[PDB]
Amino acid sequence: SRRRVVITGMGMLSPLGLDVPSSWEGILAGRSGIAPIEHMDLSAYSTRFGGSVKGFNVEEYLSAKEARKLDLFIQYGLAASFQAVRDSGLEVTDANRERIGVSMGSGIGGLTNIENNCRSLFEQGPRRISPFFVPGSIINMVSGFLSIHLGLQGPNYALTTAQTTGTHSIGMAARNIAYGEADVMVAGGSEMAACGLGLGGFGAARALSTRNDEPTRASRPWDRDRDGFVLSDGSGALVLEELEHARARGARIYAELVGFGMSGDAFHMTAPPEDGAGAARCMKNALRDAGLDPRQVDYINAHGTSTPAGDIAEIAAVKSVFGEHAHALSMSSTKSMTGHLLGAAGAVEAIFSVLALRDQVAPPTINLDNPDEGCDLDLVAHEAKPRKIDVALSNSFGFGGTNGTLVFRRFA
Amino acid sequence: SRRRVVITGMGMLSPLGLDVPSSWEGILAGRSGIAPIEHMDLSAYSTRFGGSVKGFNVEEYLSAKEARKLDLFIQYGLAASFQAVRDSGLEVTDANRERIGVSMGSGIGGLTNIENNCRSLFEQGPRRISPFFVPGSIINMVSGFLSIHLGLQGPNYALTTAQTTGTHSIGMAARNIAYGEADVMVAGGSEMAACGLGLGGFGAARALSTRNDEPTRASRPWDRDRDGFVLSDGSGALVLEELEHARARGARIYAELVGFGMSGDAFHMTAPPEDGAGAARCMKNALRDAGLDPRQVDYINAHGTSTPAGDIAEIAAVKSVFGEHAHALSMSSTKSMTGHLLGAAGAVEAIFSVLALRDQVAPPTINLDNPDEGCDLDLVAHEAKPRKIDVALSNSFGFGGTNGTLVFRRFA
Ligand SMILES: CCOC(=O)[C@@H](F)[C@H](O)c1cc(C)on1
């Protein structure tokens, strides 16, 4: 048997806002967070826009001295984690600190720092590399700094599964609680890949939208005029907690995490199979883990990246899994508004799936002006749809054919 | 209910050899794999040596066409993975491919490829970044490419917990099998951080030995004249398999994986506490997980990095956990010969711990000429020690205060 896992705290930085409620207000209003990237000469690049975090003040979280040691993606992950722990109301004590851990991940980690230290090495040589370069750029330092700051002695680790990172981080933290290795975990992901190397790396693969003239219309999942993903920055963190632990302290419970699925496509390094076979196995595994029939699903937060092959693969997977229920559920891509936060995508989308359950509303897929061939599901085009949602799924698909699915249920 | 996990296949690249048996022959002979680095001009660097893989032929494993796209850390992790799968004798079929997964991690991933693309960006422009830059550098692509080449459709992920990565990867993969999420996992880690950014970055932190004039004597764990770690490259992979699955197919079983522990120090971003409290908590978790009397432990493969603070913290932790039995067990650091493979250290050292069980021999700590104050255990100084080993423990400790311990025992 297995313990039950609930969500008692959430925290976020996104292109829509510097916390959860601001971001969520943007989501339900159909607002875009996408804009031309500032303070960077992107003349030579084929994409000049993305989803930046606007107005982030690290000194709300860290001293200027500790902030100078840490890449932006670590700053973002710590901001989301501190927000989530504050939101949970949890009091860390000597009686519980060995039972509270962290799994905050990243797909790409400290590209900005790597770029800046490369500049020093190439121009001046290795004596200009920062002493804090390695520990301030490695992906496990959100988990590391968080544990140090709050005195958390439970399982401490970090996943890096590309665009699936935030989903796998949350799912595996839920397993740690369900199987009694922890009572509380802070889990999610963070990303800041808007450097030359990030825009340039994805651009070299021709993976990005190049709709420079209308950045807010670039991210258009399932639209016939889509031309690749939009790169975005930010973080999401959830406090996962064992149910009896949450009830005993009078925690506010947002939702229950009832299932987690993983699978591998074993197909291609960057493209999914056209029929979404791996995404179908992953969703079936998550529903089996939850003891739910596909017909019980009400809302899917799609991966929905705005790539030709990815968006159509997801439609095929959902039709395969859900059969005569495939049109009854609502499925939307919040990446239509946020762009693609890579390893933080699954974290901010798990939060949006939990809020869909709290507020009984499916967020819109904006920009879905002309659904592509076979994209005939309820994709919540243009505007939020109030509806009944008892069960919400969140999907992530990543490079290497790595798949994750989370299943959330209303808690009463 | 929780299933038993055994080791059926192993594979390795190390500074001592291009496979497991050649590496283990070096270990038992007390041979150093450390030498001046040949691949680059390090005259401006404070450290000019390390543990390189010598004479690696990627065309024993991969087409030159595909090898050209992949960072060395991916090539190394695929080589070790292919070895381990072949060594296991497992045949991947439609009947079992959904039950076989992979968790190969890395501390730093494709830093050489990142540095080379950064050089292209800065000297030429973004149009010269490789289209393969992202999928050929990101940490999850050992798991991804292995899954694509062998058709593994089970859990597909990667950990990044700095110098703890390989141990965490093996333990979490064993929990996947224990809890029924998979029947087989390939797990371990790979690292190739020996580029200017890596040698420069660890150099800037003054973390590295600077014994340039005597490289084979630089790594000297618990020796009074130690002056930091030696950076080394390579990979370890193990095939983990559920016990009844292994028995059913008549697999050769090397040993049983009976315990796994994790803990966070919550102390310091890079420094271990002097008393080794987090390391002690981690070992105690692992011993309780394995259902053991601590007096059953016969052999410990230490982390043993050859840092002043790390080596003495590990003596303090072993004394705290084992009491008077601390004087009966044997403990050695194989990093005395291999150097520190960072995220691959825990993977190669898990393999050495399994072979200590197979061959009933404690590998030596070479270079231990003058044990430091309080370093008065059996540290197997200079020469391999044949002895009874029923239970072997492998420890790792990393940046962020992240700790892992694996417990292996003989299987009859
Ligand atoms: C392009 C993909 O880059 C990454 O994933 C980087 F973050 C790099 O792997 C890294 C550098 C350091 C130090 O730690 N990790």
How is the secondary structure organized here?
The structure is a homodimer of 412-residue chains.
Chain A: E1 5-13, H1 20-28, E2 35-36, E3 49-50, H2 64-68, H3 72-88, E4 100-105, H4 111-124, H5 141-150, E5 156-157, H6 165-178, E6 184-191, H7 196-204, E7 234-242, H8 243-248, E8 255-264, H9 277-290, E9 299-301, H10 308-322, E10 330-332, H11 335-338, H12 345-359, E11 361-362, E12 385-386, E13 391-398, E14 402-409
Parallel strand pairs in A: 4-5, 4-6, 9-10, 9-13
Antiparallel strand pairs in A: 1-7, 1-8, 2-3, 6-7, 8-14, 11-12, 13-14
Helix pairs in contact in A: 3-5, 6-12, 9-10
The structure holds the ligand CCOC(=O)[C@@H](F)[C@H](O)c1cc(C)on1.
The ligand CCOC(=O)[C@@H](F)[C@H](O)c1cc(C)on1 sits between chains A (108-110, 114, 134, 137-138) and B (108-109, 111, 114, 137-139).
PDB class: transferase
Keywords: SGC - Diamond I04-1 fragment screening, PanDDA, XChemExplorer, FabF, beta-ketoacyl-acyl-carrier-protein synthase II, transferase
Assembly: dimeric
**Strand order, largest beta sheet of chain A:** 5-4-6-7-1-8-14-13-9-10
Q: What percent of residues of chain A are in strands?
A: 15-25%
Tell me which protein chains meet in the greatest interface and how many residues each side has: A-B, 83 and 83 residues
* Number of helices, counting only DSSP H or I runs of 4 residues or more of chain A: 12
| Share of residues in helices of chain A | 25-40%
List the domain count of chain A as a whole number: 2
Largest sheet of chain A, described in full?
A: 10 strands, mixed
Chain oligomer state: homodimer
Number of strands of chain A: 14
Class by SSE composition of chain A = alpha/beta
Estimate the global geometry of chain A from the Cα principal axes.
Answer: globular
Radius of gyration of chain A: 20 Å
| Structure ligands | ligand Q63
Protein name (chains A, B): 3-oxoacyl-[acyl-carrier-protein] synthase 2
Domain Ketosynthase family 3 (KS3) (chains A, B): 2-410
InterPro entries (chains A, B): 3-oxoacyl-ACP_synth-2, Beta-ketoacyl_synthase, Ketoacyl_synth_AS, Ketoacyl_synth_C, Ketoacyl_synth_N, PKS_Beta-ketoAc_synthase_dom, Thiolase-like
Pfam family, one (chains A, B): Ketoacyl-synt_C
